């Protein structure tokens, strides 16, 4: 996308590595907290 942004997982989901080491993705629609990658299924 021009933009440059990079389609991971939909533009509403943030990734952020914490300091555990874990990417975790934090939703900004319903506003929730998972480690595991919802594109994994």
Same mark, same amino acid.
């Given at each position: 996308? #021009?933009?440059? $942004?990079? #389609?991971? @997982?939909?533009?509403? /989901? *943030?990734?952020? $590595? ?7 993705? $934090?939703d900004h629609n319903t506003k929730t907290?998972? /480690? *595991?990658?919802?594109? @994994?299924?």
């Amino acid at each position: 996308g #021009s933009p440059g $942004i990079q #389609s991971f @997982l939909p533009p509403g /989901w *943030e990734m952020r $590595i914490a300091p555990n080491g874990r990417p975790f993705f $934090i939703d900004h629609n319903t506003k929730t907290t998972t /480690w *595991e990658d919802p594109r @994994l299924k």
